[PDB]
Amino acid sequence: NARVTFAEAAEII
Amino acid sequence: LDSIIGRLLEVQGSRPGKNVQLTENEIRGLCLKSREIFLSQPILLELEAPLKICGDIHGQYYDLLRLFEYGGFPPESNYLFLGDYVDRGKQSLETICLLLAYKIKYPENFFLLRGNHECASINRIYGFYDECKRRYNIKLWKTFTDCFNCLPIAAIVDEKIFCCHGGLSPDLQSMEQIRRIMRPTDVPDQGLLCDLLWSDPDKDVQGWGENDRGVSFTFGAEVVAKFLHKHDLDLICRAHQVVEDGYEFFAKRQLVTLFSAPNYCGEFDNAGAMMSVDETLMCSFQILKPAD
Ligand SMILES: [Mn+2]
């Protein structure tokens, strides 16, 4: 059912 | 016992460098127990989301705690690690211990893969055997070996994300080949198992090429593309290589590279990352920078 997607923004820890 | 994991987490907040000296029996216990759990589970892990994935740690213990600090300590989250836990860094002993502890405590929500630096061939020389011999004894290092040989080699998340330390292999046609190799086993000089832990993606290479390391191969975007298609997959997750920002894409976002140990060695002057994979199989990246 589910497929791979990427959140465009990354965040600094 | 929860005593060992408690003592390991105790140095949180302390200035970076303070050791945690377990008894060899505790450590031996950690090995032998986690060893038994590794052979309990498949060599090719059928994993599920959501989970956080980390790359090379290479003994940088205080950076690992930072990752757990943000990502939530087990079982606040699930964890896959892509190998390379020891060598180069100052505190390999603490790093592998804390991990094996969690592996023992939450064997269904905490997962470890074998990286190229999980061999007697490479623990020797690159710093781990030296640490064992200085803080403990040779006999204890042999124990670790016997435990490392039982480590899982690869993992697949929800039949879509292929995870391994190094990368693809020319000898890799079917996944059942990964299930064939019986553990305990040492990594060979050449072959499927070695390729999985040593190989690299390369922009300039076309097909299968030589590796600057001196062992295994480099591979190109074509192989990645045709591999995913042939196996009903969307992404290849791997570590093994130093990349600034912590993560770096290859092909058209078909292969990501994860490195989780900031300012590696150093100098190199890089950053670390981890993948937050949620239930919708959406990946997000969180970056660690070298501390003050
Ligand atoms: Mn490596």
Side-chain angles (χ1 to χ4, degrees), chain B residues 56 58 82-84 115-117 165-166 197-198 200 213 239-241 259 264:
Chain B
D56 299 37
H58 285 292
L82 307 177
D84 271 18
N116 62 293
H117 286 268
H165 179 68
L197 270 65
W198 283 95
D200 302 322
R213 309 187 178 276
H240 191 31
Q241 285 189 308
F259 199 90
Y264 171 65

Short mmCIF file of all heavy atoms in Angstrom, two decimals, chain B residues 56 58 82-84 115-117 165-166 197-198 200 213 239-241 259 264, ligand 1:
data_model
loop_
_atom_site.label_atom_id
_atom_site.label_comp_id
_atom_site.label_asym_id
_atom_site.label_seq_id
_atom_site.Cartn_x
_atom_site.Cartn_y
_atom_site.Cartn_z
N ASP B 56 27.09 5.15 10.42
CA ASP B 56 28.32 4.98 11.19
C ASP B 56 28.35 5.81 12.47
O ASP B 56 27.99 6.99 12.46
CB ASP B 56 29.53 5.36 10.33
CG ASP B 56 29.68 4.49 9.09
OD1 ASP B 56 28.64 4.13 8.49
OD2 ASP B 56 30.83 4.19 8.71
N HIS B 58 31.19 4.86 14.79
CA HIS B 58 32.64 4.73 14.97
C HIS B 58 33.11 5.25 16.33
O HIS B 58 33.94 6.15 16.40
CB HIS B 58 33.39 5.43 13.84
CG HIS B 58 33.38 4.69 12.54
ND1 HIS B 58 34.04 3.49 12.36
CD2 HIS B 58 32.82 4.98 11.34
CE1 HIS B 58 33.87 3.07 11.12
NE2 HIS B 58 33.13 3.96 10.48
N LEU B 82 23.04 0.91 10.86
CA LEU B 82 23.65 0.37 9.65
C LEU B 82 25.12 -0.05 9.82
O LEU B 82 25.88 -0.06 8.85
CB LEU B 82 23.51 1.37 8.49
CG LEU B 82 22.11 1.91 8.18
CD1 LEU B 82 22.18 2.94 7.06
CD2 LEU B 82 21.14 0.79 7.81
N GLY B 83 25.51 -0.40 11.04
CA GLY B 83 26.85 -0.92 11.30
C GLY B 83 27.89 0.16 11.54
O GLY B 83 27.55 1.34 11.64
N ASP B 84 29.15 -0.28 11.61
CA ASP B 84 30.32 0.58 11.91
C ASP B 84 30.17 1.29 13.25
O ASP B 84 29.98 2.51 13.31
CB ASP B 84 30.59 1.58 10.78
CG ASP B 84 31.53 1.03 9.70
OD1 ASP B 84 31.70 -0.21 9.62
OD2 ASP B 84 32.08 1.84 8.93
N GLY B 115 28.47 -3.74 9.98
CA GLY B 115 29.25 -2.87 9.11
C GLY B 115 30.62 -3.47 8.87
O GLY B 115 31.02 -4.40 9.57
N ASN B 116 31.35 -2.94 7.88
CA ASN B 116 32.67 -3.47 7.53
C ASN B 116 33.64 -3.50 8.70
O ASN B 116 34.53 -4.36 8.75
CB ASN B 116 33.28 -2.74 6.32
CG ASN B 116 33.54 -1.26 6.57
OD1 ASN B 116 32.61 -0.47 6.75
ND2 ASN B 116 34.80 -0.87 6.56
N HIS B 117 33.45 -2.59 9.65
CA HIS B 117 34.30 -2.52 10.84
C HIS B 117 33.82 -3.45 11.96
O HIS B 117 34.05 -3.18 13.13
CB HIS B 117 34.39 -1.08 11.36
CG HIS B 117 35.25 -0.19 10.52
ND1 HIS B 117 36.59 -0.01 10.76
CD2 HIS B 117 34.96 0.56 9.43
CE1 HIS B 117 37.09 0.83 9.87
NE2 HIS B 117 36.12 1.18 9.05
N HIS B 165 24.96 -1.76 5.10
CA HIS B 165 26.05 -0.83 5.41
C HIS B 165 26.71 -0.25 4.16
O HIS B 165 26.73 0.97 3.98
CB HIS B 165 27.12 -1.51 6.29
CG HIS B 165 28.27 -0.62 6.62
ND1 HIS B 165 28.15 0.49 7.44
CD2 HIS B 165 29.57 -0.66 6.24
CE1 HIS B 165 29.32 1.08 7.55
NE2 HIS B 165 30.20 0.41 6.83
N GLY B 166 27.23 -1.13 3.31
CA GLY B 166 28.00 -0.71 2.14
C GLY B 166 27.14 -0.38 0.94
O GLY B 166 26.93 0.80 0.62
N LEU B 197 29.00 -5.01 2.56
CA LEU B 197 29.58 -4.24 3.66
C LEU B 197 30.68 -3.28 3.23
O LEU B 197 31.13 -2.45 4.02
CB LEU B 197 30.10 -5.19 4.74
CG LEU B 197 29.15 -5.62 5.87
CD1 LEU B 197 27.99 -6.46 5.37
CD2 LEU B 197 29.92 -6.41 6.90
N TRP B 198 31.11 -3.37 1.97
CA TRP B 198 32.24 -2.56 1.49
C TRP B 198 31.94 -1.64 0.29
O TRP B 198 32.52 -0.55 0.19
CB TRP B 198 33.41 -3.48 1.15
CG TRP B 198 34.16 -3.97 2.34
CD1 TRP B 198 33.97 -5.16 3.00
CD2 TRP B 198 35.23 -3.31 3.03
NE1 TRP B 198 34.86 -5.27 4.05
CE2 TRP B 198 35.64 -4.14 4.09
CE3 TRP B 198 35.88 -2.08 2.85
CZ2 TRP B 198 36.66 -3.79 4.96
CZ3 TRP B 198 36.90 -1.74 3.72
CH2 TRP B 198 37.28 -2.59 4.76
N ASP B 200 30.57 0.92 -2.76
CA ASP B 200 30.19 2.33 -2.77
C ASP B 200 29.46 2.75 -4.05
O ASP B 200 29.72 2.20 -5.12
CB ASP B 200 31.44 3.21 -2.63
CG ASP B 200 32.21 2.93 -1.38
OD1 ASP B 200 31.58 2.67 -0.33
OD2 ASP B 200 33.45 2.98 -1.43
N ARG B 213 39.10 2.10 -2.02
CA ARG B 213 39.38 1.36 -0.79
C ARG B 213 40.37 0.22 -1.01
O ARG B 213 41.25 -0.02 -0.18
CB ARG B 213 38.09 0.79 -0.20
CG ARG B 213 36.97 1.79 -0.04
CD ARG B 213 35.81 1.19 0.71
NE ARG B 213 34.75 2.17 0.90
CZ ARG B 213 34.73 3.06 1.88
NH1 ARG B 213 35.70 3.09 2.78
NH2 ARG B 213 33.73 3.92 1.98
N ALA B 239 25.13 3.43 4.62
CA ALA B 239 26.01 4.33 5.37
C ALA B 239 27.42 4.26 4.79
O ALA B 239 27.61 4.56 3.61
CB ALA B 239 26.01 3.95 6.84
N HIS B 240 28.40 3.91 5.61
CA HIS B 240 29.74 3.51 5.15
C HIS B 240 30.64 4.66 4.70
O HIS B 240 31.86 4.59 4.88
CB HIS B 240 29.60 2.47 4.02
CG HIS B 240 30.88 1.80 3.63
ND1 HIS B 240 31.91 1.57 4.52
CD2 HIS B 240 31.27 1.26 2.46
CE1 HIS B 240 32.89 0.94 3.90
NE2 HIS B 240 32.52 0.74 2.65
N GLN B 241 30.04 5.72 4.14
CA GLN B 241 30.81 6.83 3.56
C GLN B 241 30.56 8.16 4.24
O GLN B 241 29.43 8.49 4.60
CB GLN B 241 30.51 6.97 2.07
CG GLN B 241 31.16 5.91 1.20
CD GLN B 241 31.01 6.21 -0.27
OE1 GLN B 241 29.91 6.45 -0.76
NE2 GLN B 241 32.13 6.18 -0.99
N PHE B 259 25.40 9.09 7.43
CA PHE B 259 26.57 9.07 8.30
C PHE B 259 26.24 9.84 9.56
O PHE B 259 25.91 11.02 9.51
CB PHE B 259 27.78 9.68 7.59
CG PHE B 259 29.10 9.30 8.20
CD1 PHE B 259 29.78 8.16 7.76
CD2 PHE B 259 29.68 10.08 9.19
CE1 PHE B 259 31.02 7.81 8.30
CE2 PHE B 259 30.91 9.73 9.75
CZ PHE B 259 31.58 8.59 9.30
N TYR B 264 34.04 13.49 12.06
CA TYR B 264 34.61 12.14 12.08
C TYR B 264 36.14 12.13 12.15
O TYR B 264 36.81 12.69 11.27
CB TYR B 264 34.10 11.36 10.85
CG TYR B 264 34.75 10.01 10.60
CD1 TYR B 264 34.58 8.96 11.50
CD2 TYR B 264 35.50 9.78 9.45
CE1 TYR B 264 35.17 7.71 11.27
CE2 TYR B 264 36.08 8.54 9.20
CZ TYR B 264 35.91 7.51 10.12
OH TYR B 264 36.49 6.29 9.88
MN MN C 1 32.34 1.59 6.77
#
